[PDB]
Structures are given as C-alpha cells and as structure tokens.
Amino acid sequence: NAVVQLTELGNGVVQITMKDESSRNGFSPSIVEGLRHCFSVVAQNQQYKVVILTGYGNYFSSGASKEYLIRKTRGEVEVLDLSGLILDCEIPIIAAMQGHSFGGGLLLGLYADFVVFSQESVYATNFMKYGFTPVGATSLILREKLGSELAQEMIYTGENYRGKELAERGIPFPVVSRQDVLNYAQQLGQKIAKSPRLSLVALKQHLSADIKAKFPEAIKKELEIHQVTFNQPEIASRIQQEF
Amino acid sequence: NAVVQLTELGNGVVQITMKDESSRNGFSPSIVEGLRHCFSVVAQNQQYKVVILTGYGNYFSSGASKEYLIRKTRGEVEVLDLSGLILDCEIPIIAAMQGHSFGGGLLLGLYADFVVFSQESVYATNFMKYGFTPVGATSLILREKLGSELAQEMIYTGENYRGKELAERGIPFPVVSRQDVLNYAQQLGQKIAKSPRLSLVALKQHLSADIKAKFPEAIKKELEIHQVTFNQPEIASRIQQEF
Amino acid sequence: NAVVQLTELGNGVVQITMKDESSRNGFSPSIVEGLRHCFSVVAQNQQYKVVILTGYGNYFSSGASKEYLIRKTRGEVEVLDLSGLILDCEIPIIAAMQGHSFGGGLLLGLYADFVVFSQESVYATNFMKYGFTPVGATSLILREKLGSELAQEMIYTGENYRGKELAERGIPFPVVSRQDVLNYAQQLGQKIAKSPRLSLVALKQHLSADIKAKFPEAIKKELEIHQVTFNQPEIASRIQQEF
C-alpha cells in the first residue's frame, strides 16, 4: 500500500497518515508524492471540512534526510519546499504530531492551522546543529506560532526539545501524552466540522492572509542566506558528525 | 433610572456600569444609548483619568440578541458597530468582565486597554456556532490581545470557554474569582490614575496607533465576508436551533 | 580598573561586566564609555561568537540618574540613547540581569537577543512613575519581547515588578534565582557558540531585520511625545518626591 493514506473519520473530518517507516517519515519521494496525492483527493471531495495530518509510531516527520544534505554539499540537488502543498489546502488542517518532528518536519506541522504536540517526543529546528541557517520561512512561521523567544532559542541552538519542555516553556499549543495526541486532534476536528464548509473556507482564507502575504519573500530571503551559510568549508564535516 | 450609570471612584477613576437586566446587557437600544451618553459625560469631564467598564450580576455583555439575528436573516437591519464609541475614548479603559461575555460582547471588552476575566463565567466569539463568520474586527483584536492560537480556536469553534479554562490556556490577562473582578479592576485603575492626565492621554494615543491604523480595513474585510457567509440557505435554521 | 570589563569564557563566549558601584550601574559617563570600549574590543576580535552582558551585586542597570532627570527639567541636557551601541553588535548578546533593572536599564537588557531575569530582583519601566512618557522605543521593544499586555501594564503604571511576579505573569523569558542567573546565561551562550560565527552573524541579521526597520521611527516618535509630557508644570516636583 501507499505510504500516505487518507481515511474518513465522519462529519467531513479526514485523516492523512504518513507511514514511511524506511525513512521515518522523512521527505522521501514516496512521502512527497503521497502527500500531494492525498491533498489532491481532499481538494476534490467537497464534503470534507477538516484534515488531520499525522505520522506513525514514534515519528511525525524527520524532514530532509542526512544523505540528502550530504548530496547537497556537492551541489547535486535543489531545496525541497512543501509549503505550497500545505498552504494551498483550503480547509483547516490539524497537525497531530504524535511523534518526533525535525527540521522541515517540524515546519510541515507548523504550517497547519492547529498543532498538537506529544509530551514524550522530541522537536527541533536543527539546521544550526549542522551549522547553517534555516529554509522554508522557519523564522516567519516559528515566531508567529511559537512566539519570538522560544522560536529564537530553538533556531539558534538547533537543539532537541521534548514536548514536555516546550509546555513548561509556555508554548501556545496543546501538549499531551503520545497516546492521546491523535484523539485530541480528532475531537478538535469534530468541533470545527460543525460549521458549514463555506464558512470554514472563508474564515481560513481571511485568517491566513497576513502570513501568506509575507511568505514568498520570507522563503526567498531564507534561501539566499542558507546558500551562503551552507556553502562554507566546515559544513561537510559537521554533517558527517551528525550521522 | 438609566440602564447605564456612571459613578466616581476617586482620584479620577470612574466606573460605567451596564445593567439592562431585560436583555442581559445585550446590545439593546437602551445599552447603546446609555454607553454613548456615559462616554460623552466622561469626554467632557477633564478630571477623569481612567474608566472601568463593567456589567451587573452574571453578565458583562451578551452582545447582539438572537431576535436581532433572526431579523437580519430577512435582510431587515444593518450591523451594529460599537468600536468607534469605545475607541474614541481618549483615557484608558479597563473592562472588568465580572460575568459572561458573548460575541460582540466579548469584543466590547477586548476593545479596552486592560481586561479582567472571571474564573467562573463563560466567554465566546460564537458567530461560527450559528455558522457564519465574525464582524467587528474580531480576528484583528482577538489575535492581538489573546494571541493567535487561542484566538483561532475560539473563532473557529465558536465554543463557550470558562475564564478558568482560558487561564489554563495561558491567556495574557488576569482571571480572578467573580467576586474579585471589579475590585481587581479598581485597584489597577487607581495605580494608573497616579499619572498626570496629559501623560495618560499621550501614552494611550501612542500605544493604540498601530491597531487603530489597521481597524477600518479589518472591519470592512470582516463585514464583506460576513455578508456572504451569513446569507446562505442553512443559516436561518442554525440560528433557530440556538434559541 | 575600568568599571566595564571584558573577560573570555571559552569557545568564543565573552562576558562584559558592568561594575560602577558609585552609580549602581547607572548610565554614568564611566559606564557609557566602558560599554562602548568593550563592544569595540568585541567587534575587533573575530574569534568571539556570543556576548553575555551582566552587572555586579544587586544591580544590572539603574538607567538614567535622578540627578540627570532634575538637570533635564531645567533643559540642561539631551536624551542619552544606547540602542545604537547594543544594536550595532553583530553577534548574539545575552543579558544576564542578575540584579535590578530600571528605565533605560531594563531597555538596555531587552535590546539583547536573549534575556535572563532574577526571581528576587525588581524590574520597572518607571518613566510614568515620574509622570512622563518613555524614551528609547520602550513600547516597540517591550511589546515585542514581553508581549503587549505585560508591556502595557508596566509602561502605564511605572511600577516595580519582582522577577518572580513577572514569571507568574507568563513572561516569555527564563526567571531564575539570583545566584543562578549568570550561570544560566553562560550555559546558553555555550550552546549558541557551537555554530560557526558566519552563521550566527547571518542569522542574527535576518532575525533582527523587522525590529531594526521600525526602530528609528519608534525612537523619534517616543522622543517627541516625551518632550511634551516631560515639560509640564508638575513634573519637577514629582521627580523631587522620587528621591
């Protein structure tokens, strides 16, 4: 079966589940194509009103693979950007992050309208751990959703934070036990799905307008800086040591 | 006596109390005219430095009446907007929300410079409960004052939140026992009233400038979307069932 | 010895310590010249990656002296502005506020990229206590870093808040025991210093861009209002009574 599956939960709530065990829900060709396909099925089905995006087991999304980053050091690829994919969805998305989220994987979840974290799992914007600056409008999104101070610490350090540590820090999102994350997202989705679809779509467009306006320039600015900081002598070795 | 009364608390602190029991401090002609009158008396009395706006009993403001909304479905009225009224006041306002606040009633309080919530009372931006989008620059104000995440949940769900639940959620305002709300507002007003009036007025103008700049466009945008989402087939029936 | 001293902590982390006991780390000529000198030494040493700015004993910075304010009432001076000095530093700064911070002294710390507060010490933007409006882009910075609601209360009241009270209020920064403040800042500095300097500088420039864009107009606007509110009949007497 496909590594990304769409299921119906009732009342217009649907669940898109990522299960690429081989990459631990990394940004693999299978995951990218599966997400694109599942979101296209959603766009086509006018009865759907809320999407819950979730992972499998211990992983929500581990983002770009270390093998991919190494390939990048030899200038062999370009930078993947899934923002368009998620941001194009016209109905509300809840990211039920029941497992770990790293790098673009944390951003993937934070692109959503609502986010649920697991107490026991680990979250990081770890670009700076490898020694280079973020991509994907990380600072725009993280500052908007997490608050400027938490965003800044996470981005500068690149460190791994448990959900429980983030909660203690005053993150504005629910942080619950791993076994409760998806259930929490589902209950919230059902509350939201009580509204007419037309109203949900209109409201989401209204609420997203300010960030969407700022997004293309943010992505561009971060890419330009990333190209400079990634292409420095010591980066290849730093990436080697994170294996 | 008038349903809206102004009393002096000393040192330039005044209290405007809404007590329209018949409408439960809804946006009745009596409440609108009483607020306009009390704020005009305030504008004229240069010795006043801080206004505390409060309700009576279990209600701060229940906003627009369900009978009014039904009338609206038959296109019989226009949309009331009290923002100009509150935002024109040149001295600081503290909304002592000792009781429930719904819809425009919660916005009325959130237009103020400082807000105090009751632990036991219920608060909602419930437009989406009836199935249509907000008016009154709800998303501008709620996102600015409550933070984007709480604002988003409240707006999308339209649900009733107890003050205690909001406090647990990390709302940036004081949430205290119902019997302590007005006393808390009064003590804060007295602290603020220690400054010269000229300084209070100058500071308030400075601090309010950014939001006031964004307000006319926000009100307009929300009205346009509200007109579309309100005038859909199923709305009349949804309103009927909220009685 | 000089009242402002730079020491190396290892791995590119340096500490700038203010110790003007005579003024309690006020904005004295010695402190201003010492800060300028220590930041110039930092700018010149490309091996440095993080600055920790701290005070001595019970004081981080007491800001402008009351004797200076009195001199100002007779129109005898101009307004000191250390923002340029701190904001010009191209590497990340952590303000380890182990002691009290007042007025410009609190702003001095809040200009930094990261801030650590002491539980037992007192913090105030106390301009309004003397009866006039702030300078130094206080409302821009405080609203951005502390959140709009806490910022507003602090600015309007001008009152002294213990670190513990701020923590209870949900300030987005660490608040720890006085004896732990500098150690906490040092550990954070060491985490940040793991990144290449080029990346730290590029990231800081990116993250600071939005506020830096708004800063010159904010400083100007606040100065203009301050000139009006400071030069009112009763201010001299209010300043006299704060001695």
XYZ file of C-alpha atoms in Angstrom:
729
model
C 0.000 0.000 0.000
C 0.851 3.686 -0.394
C 2.939 5.207 2.451
C 0.452 8.089 2.784
C -3.178 7.097 3.346
C -6.402 9.081 3.614
C -9.218 7.848 5.833
C -12.635 9.292 6.678
C -13.476 9.950 10.317
C -17.086 11.149 9.870
C -18.790 14.558 9.573
C -16.272 15.747 6.988
C -13.175 15.135 9.202
C -10.480 13.165 7.316
C -7.106 11.864 8.408
C -3.951 11.820 6.262
C -1.457 9.396 7.804
C 2.230 9.304 6.834
C 3.824 5.906 7.288
C 7.176 5.671 5.504
C 8.966 3.546 8.057
C 12.076 3.220 5.828
C 12.775 6.987 6.080
C 10.990 7.505 9.417
C 8.559 9.819 7.656
C 11.410 11.777 6.113
C 10.902 13.874 2.980
C 11.258 10.826 0.708
C 9.911 10.723 -2.857
C 7.189 8.361 -1.524
C 6.150 10.793 1.216
C 6.142 13.843 -1.096
C 4.127 12.107 -3.805
C 1.799 10.547 -1.177
C 1.101 13.924 0.441
C 0.464 15.546 -2.942
C -1.921 12.728 -3.892
C -3.821 12.745 -0.557
C -4.202 16.537 -0.620
C -5.478 16.387 -4.205
C -8.103 13.783 -3.140
C -9.077 16.161 -0.345
C -9.383 19.180 -2.728
C -11.718 17.171 -4.931
C -14.066 15.952 -2.220
C -16.281 18.950 -1.295
C -17.810 17.045 1.624
C -14.508 17.232 3.560
C -14.163 20.068 6.063
C -11.097 19.319 8.264
C -7.857 17.406 7.666
C -5.872 15.810 10.469
C -2.287 15.193 9.365
C -0.391 12.638 11.438
C 2.519 10.176 11.373
C 3.050 6.601 12.544
C 4.718 5.147 15.637
C 7.390 7.414 17.114
C 7.637 9.854 14.141
C 5.571 12.698 12.784
C 8.240 13.813 10.256
C 12.008 13.669 10.305
C 12.296 16.137 7.398
C 15.214 16.124 4.956
C 17.484 13.077 5.159
C 21.125 13.372 6.162
C 22.002 11.501 2.936
C 20.207 14.315 1.033
C 22.166 17.026 2.888
C 25.475 15.315 2.030
C 24.404 15.249 -1.652
C 23.635 18.964 -1.373
C 27.223 19.720 -0.171
C 28.439 18.550 -3.569
C 25.852 20.919 -5.128
C 23.924 17.983 -6.524
C 20.327 18.998 -5.737
C 17.932 21.873 -5.022
C 15.899 22.711 -1.898
C 12.551 20.918 -1.423
C 9.678 23.183 -0.340
C 6.363 21.592 0.775
C 4.864 24.857 1.957
C 2.901 25.422 -1.281
C 1.416 21.979 -0.918
C 0.123 22.508 2.648
C -0.717 26.200 2.261
C -2.814 25.564 -0.842
C -5.272 23.378 1.130
C -8.455 25.492 1.505
C -9.873 23.709 4.598
C -8.400 23.738 8.134
C -5.572 21.309 8.928
C -4.661 19.993 12.389
C -1.162 18.542 12.681
C -1.330 15.743 15.232
C 2.357 15.429 15.941
C 2.235 12.174 17.943
C 5.944 11.588 17.350
C 9.230 13.388 16.771
C 9.495 16.280 14.305
C 12.811 17.552 12.914
C 13.746 20.462 10.651
C 11.411 20.761 7.720
C 9.385 18.095 9.567
C 8.587 20.488 12.404
C 7.810 23.234 9.857
C 5.495 20.868 7.996
C 3.414 20.567 11.165
C 3.638 24.271 11.987
C 2.273 25.217 8.527
C -1.047 23.762 9.733
C -3.859 25.803 11.303
C -3.764 23.870 14.598
C -0.949 21.768 16.093
C -0.917 19.123 18.846
C 2.407 18.035 20.405
C 3.403 14.834 22.252
C 4.897 15.245 25.784
C 7.475 12.477 25.290
C 8.598 13.209 21.723
C 11.408 15.458 20.590
C 11.113 18.591 18.362
C 13.885 20.623 16.709
C 14.654 23.149 14.021
C 18.130 21.636 13.789
C 19.642 23.453 10.775
C 22.022 25.301 13.090
C 23.134 21.996 14.614
C 24.696 21.181 11.231
C 25.962 24.761 11.236
C 23.821 26.547 8.629
C 20.737 28.749 8.577
C 17.125 27.533 8.065
C 14.981 27.273 4.948
C 11.218 27.269 4.489
C 10.370 30.586 6.204
C 11.291 28.941 9.523
C 11.691 32.256 11.347
C 8.420 33.703 9.993
C 6.415 30.622 10.931
C 8.121 29.736 14.198
C 7.983 33.294 15.512
C 4.323 33.633 14.559
C 3.245 30.274 16.055
C 5.625 29.636 18.955
C 6.369 33.231 19.930
C 9.585 35.120 19.156
C 11.578 33.992 22.240
C 11.066 30.238 22.016
C 11.471 30.492 18.249
C 14.803 32.272 18.679
C 16.256 29.754 21.141
C 15.174 26.804 19.021
C 16.608 28.318 15.832
C 19.939 29.497 17.265
C 20.726 26.325 19.239
C 19.220 23.779 16.816
C 18.676 21.592 19.900
C 16.136 18.823 20.559
C 13.279 19.805 22.895
C 10.851 17.295 24.433
C 7.185 18.324 24.168
C 7.102 18.481 27.984
C 9.965 21.005 27.984
C 8.133 23.146 25.411
C 4.976 23.053 27.545
C 6.990 24.165 30.595
C 8.291 26.992 28.405
C 4.751 28.200 27.642
C 4.270 27.080 24.036
C 0.745 28.229 22.905
C -0.283 24.731 21.716
C -1.643 21.637 23.469
C 0.994 19.182 24.624
C -0.455 15.808 25.633
C 0.677 12.201 26.158
C 1.713 10.424 22.955
C -1.258 8.022 23.163
C -3.669 10.995 23.467
C -2.335 13.234 20.642
C -4.348 11.852 17.740
C -7.546 11.552 19.860
C -7.155 15.185 20.944
C -6.757 16.291 17.265
C -9.814 14.223 16.280
C -12.030 15.791 18.956
C -10.928 19.275 17.941
C -11.573 18.423 14.245
C -15.119 17.321 15.093
C -15.775 20.645 16.889
C -14.534 22.612 13.889
C -16.512 20.449 11.421
C -19.797 21.636 12.995
C -19.571 24.785 10.831
C -20.651 24.950 7.185
C -17.811 24.287 4.782
C -18.288 27.632 3.024
C -17.761 29.430 6.319
C -14.675 27.356 7.232
C -13.084 28.099 3.855
C -13.890 31.843 4.023
C -12.623 32.115 7.566
C -9.391 30.246 6.831
C -8.677 32.471 3.821
C -9.237 35.576 5.977
C -7.095 34.389 8.921
C -4.195 33.167 6.695
C -3.965 36.294 4.588
C -1.336 38.211 6.576
C 1.162 35.320 6.773
C 0.523 34.214 3.170
C 1.327 37.791 2.059
C 4.747 37.593 3.825
C 5.586 34.002 2.804
C 7.107 34.313 -0.710
C 9.621 36.984 0.405
C 10.442 35.041 3.613
C 11.162 31.818 1.679
C 13.344 33.777 -0.766
C 15.306 35.633 1.934
C 15.987 32.444 3.921
C 17.090 30.562 0.789
C 19.623 33.280 -0.105
C 21.163 33.242 3.388
C 21.082 29.450 3.538
C 23.058 29.229 0.272
C 25.849 31.366 1.763
C 25.991 29.658 5.173
C 25.629 26.087 3.845
C 28.456 26.549 1.368
C 31.270 27.102 3.854
C 34.361 24.821 4.275
C 33.469 23.176 7.611
C 29.827 22.251 6.879
C 30.504 18.885 5.188
C 32.401 17.654 8.240
C 29.698 18.929 10.624
C 27.090 16.992 8.660
C 29.323 13.872 8.746
C 29.449 14.019 12.532
C 25.642 14.224 12.909
C 25.237 10.732 11.380
C -33.088 55.022 36.254
C -30.903 54.707 33.158
C -29.565 51.177 32.437
C -26.016 52.553 32.098
C -24.720 54.561 35.058
C -21.510 56.486 35.686
C -20.085 56.720 39.193
C -16.937 58.348 40.576
C -14.455 56.186 42.459
C -11.953 58.910 43.456
C -8.667 60.227 42.014
C -10.135 60.465 38.518
C -11.178 56.759 38.317
C -14.812 56.393 37.153
C -16.996 53.347 36.683
C -19.520 52.847 33.864
C -21.918 50.064 34.850
C -24.235 48.333 32.364
C -27.391 46.972 33.939
C -30.000 46.073 31.320
C -31.388 43.002 33.015
C -34.139 42.596 30.365
C -31.538 41.900 27.627
C -28.822 40.594 29.975
C -26.632 43.500 28.915
C -27.237 42.731 25.256
C -26.756 45.382 22.572
C -30.209 46.875 23.224
C -31.157 50.433 22.233
C -31.011 51.278 25.979
C -27.482 49.897 26.350
C -26.175 51.593 23.176
C -27.654 54.975 24.066
C -26.540 54.583 27.722
C -22.951 53.803 26.712
C -22.872 56.732 24.285
C -24.223 59.061 26.984
C -21.829 57.837 29.724
C -18.809 58.095 27.412
C -19.835 61.621 26.403
C -20.036 62.604 30.118
C -16.555 61.140 30.516
C -15.156 63.088 27.492
C -16.462 66.309 28.996
C -15.047 65.864 32.482
C -11.290 66.614 32.215
C -10.707 65.476 35.800
C -11.370 61.831 34.820
C -8.324 59.702 34.033
C -9.460 56.027 33.934
C -12.767 54.337 33.082
C -13.745 50.943 34.447
C -16.465 49.387 32.295
C -18.436 46.606 33.969
C -21.764 44.745 33.932
C -24.216 43.558 36.580
C -24.805 40.156 38.175
C -23.785 37.250 35.946
C -23.351 39.276 32.696
C -20.769 41.632 31.289
C -22.343 41.728 27.787
C -24.300 39.184 25.807
C -23.836 41.132 22.548
C -26.347 41.012 19.693
C -29.681 39.383 20.533
C -30.834 36.207 18.819
C -34.069 38.051 17.923
C -31.879 40.634 16.108
C -30.008 37.915 14.176
C -33.309 36.371 13.021
C -34.416 39.832 11.793
C -31.114 40.094 9.921
C -31.806 36.799 8.035
C -34.757 38.539 6.402
C -32.360 41.397 5.496
C -34.219 43.755 7.791
C -31.330 45.551 9.529
C -27.667 46.581 9.336
C -24.679 45.594 11.503
C -24.165 47.490 14.789
C -20.566 48.569 15.451
C -19.639 49.962 18.910
C -15.925 50.042 18.199
C -15.922 53.758 17.278
C -17.624 54.515 20.553
C -15.045 52.710 22.736
C -12.013 53.516 20.580
C -12.790 57.234 20.593
C -12.368 57.425 24.400
C -9.034 59.241 24.974
C -8.340 57.897 28.506
C -7.524 54.278 29.460
C -10.415 51.830 29.883
C -10.366 48.657 31.997
C -13.068 46.126 31.148
C -13.994 44.366 34.376
C -15.754 41.386 32.888
C -17.283 40.010 36.111
C -19.821 37.989 34.128
C -20.344 36.213 30.820
C -19.360 37.843 27.520
C -20.646 36.659 24.130
C -19.893 37.692 20.549
C -19.774 41.429 20.166
C -19.981 41.430 23.984
C -16.558 39.819 24.296
C -15.201 42.205 21.632
C -16.640 45.162 23.532
C -14.467 44.186 26.499
C -11.432 43.382 24.356
C -11.534 46.862 22.739
C -10.464 48.189 26.158
C -6.854 48.867 27.180
C -6.936 46.367 30.070
C -9.271 43.402 30.640
C -10.093 41.357 33.758
C -11.889 37.993 33.411
C -14.000 35.988 35.897
C -12.907 32.353 36.587
C -16.485 31.037 36.719
C -18.029 32.942 33.802
C -18.217 31.890 30.183
C -16.671 33.713 27.158
C -17.228 33.077 23.439
C -16.865 34.543 19.986
C -19.830 32.418 18.926
C -20.511 33.639 15.359
C -19.300 30.306 13.993
C -21.685 28.467 16.319
C -24.534 29.960 14.268
C -22.461 29.072 11.212
C -21.178 32.422 9.908
C -18.011 34.490 10.153
C -17.356 37.290 12.706
C -17.833 41.046 12.490
C -16.167 43.895 14.356
C -12.507 43.142 13.519
C -12.772 40.072 15.772
C -9.685 38.407 14.295
C -7.556 41.579 14.480
C -8.478 42.249 18.098
C -8.584 38.686 19.387
C -5.267 37.757 17.793
C -3.608 40.901 19.126
C -4.959 40.541 22.693
C -5.369 36.800 23.257
C -2.609 35.537 20.975
C -3.115 33.951 17.548
C -3.623 30.336 18.744
C -6.294 30.887 21.383
C -7.929 33.425 19.079
C -8.055 30.865 16.270
C -9.612 28.090 18.364
C -12.212 30.424 19.830
C -13.158 31.832 16.418
C -13.304 28.531 14.514
C -15.233 26.570 17.162
C -17.450 29.410 18.446
C -17.498 27.496 21.751
C -18.040 28.727 25.321
C -14.875 28.875 27.453
C -14.899 29.373 31.235
C -12.419 32.000 32.468
C -10.614 29.207 34.347
C -10.132 27.273 31.093
C -8.719 30.388 29.401
C -6.303 30.898 32.304
C -5.148 27.270 31.999
C -4.608 28.005 28.304
C -2.271 30.918 29.096
C -4.431 33.941 28.271
C -2.305 37.119 28.906
C -4.944 38.730 31.175
C -5.844 38.363 34.856
C -8.504 35.773 35.586
C -9.893 36.023 39.123
C -12.946 34.919 41.130
C -16.181 36.638 40.095
C -16.427 38.489 43.435
C -12.860 39.834 42.979
C -13.053 41.028 39.330
C -14.348 44.549 39.888
C -12.073 45.100 42.943
C -9.062 43.990 40.887
C -10.012 46.457 38.072
C -10.479 49.251 40.635
C -7.044 48.712 42.197
C -5.403 48.696 38.778
C -7.319 51.893 37.822
C -6.024 53.633 40.953
C -2.420 52.693 40.045
C -2.847 54.082 36.538
C -4.560 57.265 37.811
C -1.357 58.265 39.659
C -0.030 59.693 36.366
C -0.943 63.130 35.009
C -3.888 63.039 32.643
C -1.889 64.630 29.818
C 0.627 61.801 30.015
C -2.074 59.088 30.121
C -3.760 60.540 27.033
C -0.466 60.909 25.106
C 0.639 57.419 26.019
C -2.690 55.837 25.073
C -2.666 57.581 21.686
C 0.882 56.311 21.051
C 0.195 52.702 22.132
C -3.125 52.445 20.189
C -1.792 53.828 16.936
C -0.794 50.573 15.221
C -4.127 48.795 15.828
C -6.197 51.922 15.083
C -4.379 52.174 11.720
C -5.464 48.582 10.840
C -9.027 48.826 12.215
C -11.062 50.430 9.380
C -9.816 47.894 6.789
C -10.303 44.977 9.236
C -13.923 45.977 9.972
C -14.584 46.326 6.228
C -12.994 42.984 5.285
C -14.879 41.084 8.009
C -18.195 42.708 7.043
C -17.789 41.657 3.391
C -17.075 38.026 4.329
C -19.827 38.012 6.944
C -22.383 39.135 4.330
C -21.514 36.140 2.127
C -21.401 33.520 4.901
C -24.485 34.793 6.776
C -26.608 34.753 3.639
C -26.515 31.019 2.969
C -29.585 28.672 2.960
C -28.944 26.796 6.230
C -28.150 29.778 8.497
C -31.752 30.626 9.474
C -32.304 27.101 10.774
C -28.974 27.107 12.653
C -29.987 30.331 14.382
C -33.409 28.815 15.232
C -31.727 25.906 16.986
C -29.521 28.157 19.165
C -32.612 29.606 20.909
C 40.426 49.384 36.923
C 37.769 50.243 34.341
C 34.135 49.929 35.550
C 33.265 47.804 32.496
C 35.412 44.710 31.956
C 35.541 42.082 29.220
C 36.523 38.515 30.052
C 36.785 35.368 27.929
C 34.736 32.336 28.923
C 35.978 29.895 26.244
C 34.719 28.768 22.815
C 34.118 32.351 21.702
C 31.756 33.237 24.618
C 32.781 36.529 26.293
C 31.366 38.369 29.274
C 31.026 42.158 29.578
C 30.543 43.051 33.245
C 29.316 46.468 34.412
C 30.535 47.408 37.865
C 30.023 51.110 38.580
C 29.128 50.805 42.233
C 29.044 54.617 42.687
C 26.048 54.936 40.306
C 24.729 51.391 40.843
C 25.376 50.691 37.174
C 23.518 53.832 36.161
C 24.120 55.484 32.788
C 27.239 57.280 34.062
C 29.962 58.610 31.749
C 32.142 55.709 33.013
C 29.512 53.098 32.142
C 28.772 54.576 28.689
C 32.438 54.858 27.741
C 33.168 51.394 29.233
C 30.363 49.766 27.234
C 31.485 51.491 24.033
C 35.074 50.351 24.625
C 34.146 46.727 25.485
C 31.845 46.438 22.459
C 34.576 47.834 20.202
C 37.018 45.186 21.553
C 34.360 42.587 20.776
C 33.830 43.890 17.183
C 37.553 43.601 16.557
C 38.020 40.063 17.829
C 36.606 37.752 15.107
C 37.006 34.703 17.349
C 34.165 35.917 19.617
C 30.710 34.499 18.920
C 28.462 35.371 21.917
C 28.462 38.228 24.439
C 26.978 37.899 27.908
C 26.226 41.334 29.354
C 25.831 41.429 33.130
C 26.063 43.692 36.189
C 27.527 43.363 39.679
C 25.944 42.604 43.052
C 22.286 43.621 43.264
C 22.196 45.733 40.041
C 22.083 45.037 36.340
C 21.426 48.696 35.377
C 19.626 51.505 37.134
C 19.459 53.606 33.942
C 19.381 57.409 33.972
C 20.171 59.021 37.327
C 17.610 61.103 39.186
C 20.218 63.905 39.323
C 20.295 63.771 35.485
C 16.485 63.997 35.248
C 16.460 67.074 37.516
C 19.088 68.688 35.236
C 16.840 67.883 32.274
C 13.887 69.788 33.868
C 15.957 72.951 33.541
C 16.531 71.999 29.867
C 20.221 71.498 30.517
C 20.890 68.258 28.608
C 19.766 65.951 25.792
C 18.475 62.356 25.875
C 21.065 59.541 26.010
C 20.379 56.639 23.631
C 22.461 53.425 23.953
C 20.372 51.482 21.471
C 22.774 52.125 18.560
C 25.601 50.806 20.672
C 23.902 47.481 21.529
C 22.077 47.062 18.216
C 25.269 47.528 16.211
C 26.846 44.404 17.782
C 26.808 41.735 15.023
C 26.975 38.654 17.310
C 24.254 37.439 19.718
C 24.026 39.077 23.153
C 22.522 37.503 26.284
C 21.589 39.964 29.023
C 22.114 38.193 32.334
C 20.100 40.508 34.518
C 21.212 39.137 37.909
C 20.093 42.329 39.646
C 17.587 45.165 39.427
C 16.904 46.953 36.132
C 15.188 50.352 35.907
C 14.047 52.511 32.992
C 16.640 52.674 30.274
C 18.390 49.964 32.326
C 15.612 47.471 31.636
C 15.588 48.528 27.960
C 19.349 48.034 27.783
C 18.816 44.385 28.718
C 15.780 43.973 26.469
C 17.756 45.207 23.418
C 19.700 41.930 23.684
C 18.861 38.755 21.745
C 18.264 36.683 24.900
C 17.434 37.846 28.440
C 17.646 36.090 31.824
C 15.852 37.583 34.860
C 16.460 37.156 38.615
C 13.477 35.955 40.745
C 14.317 38.254 43.672
C 15.260 41.436 41.800
C 13.000 44.273 40.759
C 12.302 45.480 37.165
C 10.495 48.632 36.006
C 9.930 50.950 33.088
C 9.343 53.739 35.599
C 9.062 56.839 33.367
C 5.360 57.090 34.190
C 6.160 56.964 37.908
C 7.814 60.374 37.473
C 4.799 61.284 35.351
C 6.125 61.364 31.773
C 6.218 59.049 28.773
C 9.104 56.677 27.862
C 12.078 57.113 25.550
C 14.203 54.579 23.697
C 11.459 52.775 21.727
C 10.248 51.306 25.036
C 6.825 50.372 23.660
C 8.239 48.780 20.483
C 10.762 46.687 22.392
C 8.685 45.836 25.446
C 5.653 44.828 23.400
C 7.773 42.693 21.085
C 9.711 40.935 23.885
C 7.339 40.830 26.859
C 4.033 40.709 24.993
C 1.611 43.620 24.578
C -0.345 43.107 27.844
C 2.533 42.911 30.309
C 4.263 45.689 28.383
C 1.185 47.898 28.711
C 0.769 47.403 32.465
C 4.451 48.014 33.123
C 4.509 51.174 30.994
C 1.273 52.729 32.279
C 1.894 52.060 35.986
C 5.688 52.546 36.007
C 5.695 50.134 38.968
C 8.431 47.818 40.273
C 7.893 44.119 39.493
C 9.911 41.307 41.098
C 11.192 38.707 38.615
C 9.002 36.135 40.398
C 5.902 38.263 39.750
C 6.819 38.550 36.057
C 7.257 34.769 35.848
C 3.819 34.269 37.435
C 2.511 36.658 34.776
C 3.888 34.478 31.960
C 6.882 36.497 30.758
C 8.495 34.572 27.807
C 11.998 34.618 29.370
C 13.755 32.476 31.981
C 13.438 33.731 35.536
C 15.841 32.015 37.940
C 17.389 32.564 41.385
C 19.843 35.470 41.532
C 22.801 33.121 42.149
C 21.847 31.071 39.045
C 21.269 33.908 36.517
C 24.805 34.314 35.207
C 25.409 30.514 35.127
C 22.193 30.055 33.136
C 23.309 32.760 30.615
C 26.752 31.127 30.340
C 25.315 27.681 29.572
C 23.015 29.139 26.933
C 25.962 31.092 25.415
C 27.981 27.875 25.138
C 25.093 26.163 23.287
C 24.839 29.047 20.832
C 28.636 29.203 20.341
C 28.598 25.680 18.836
C 27.595 27.236 15.487
C 30.053 28.818 13.048
C 30.425 32.545 13.549
C 29.414 33.303 9.956
C 26.119 31.514 10.513
C 25.460 33.263 13.855
C 26.059 36.673 12.274
C 23.871 35.913 9.218
C 21.088 34.536 11.359
C 21.139 37.476 13.775
C 20.980 39.967 10.896
C 17.988 38.093 9.431
C 16.076 37.785 12.735
C 16.691 41.448 13.768
C 15.670 42.971 10.466
C 11.981 43.623 11.179
C 12.557 45.409 14.513
C 15.619 47.308 13.233
C 13.457 48.603 10.348
C 10.908 50.023 12.867
C 13.453 51.366 15.390
C 14.449 54.819 14.031
C 10.802 55.950 13.689
C 9.900 54.482 17.120
C 12.767 56.332 18.853
C 11.743 59.561 17.092
C 8.030 59.244 17.924
C 8.708 58.488 21.606
C 11.159 61.399 21.896
C 8.592 63.865 20.508
C 5.906 62.730 22.972
C 8.388 62.612 25.842
C 9.375 66.251 25.202
C 5.736 67.350 25.568
C 4.903 65.235 28.635
C 8.200 65.876 30.468
C 7.871 69.629 30.086
C 4.721 70.109 32.149
C 4.472 72.187 35.397
C 4.151 69.342 37.932
C 6.982 67.088 36.680
C 9.829 68.748 38.625
C 8.007 68.186 41.910
C 7.171 64.567 41.003
C 10.848 63.915 40.326
C 11.770 65.576 43.660
C 9.500 63.181 45.526
C 11.042 60.062 43.923
C 14.420 60.802 45.577
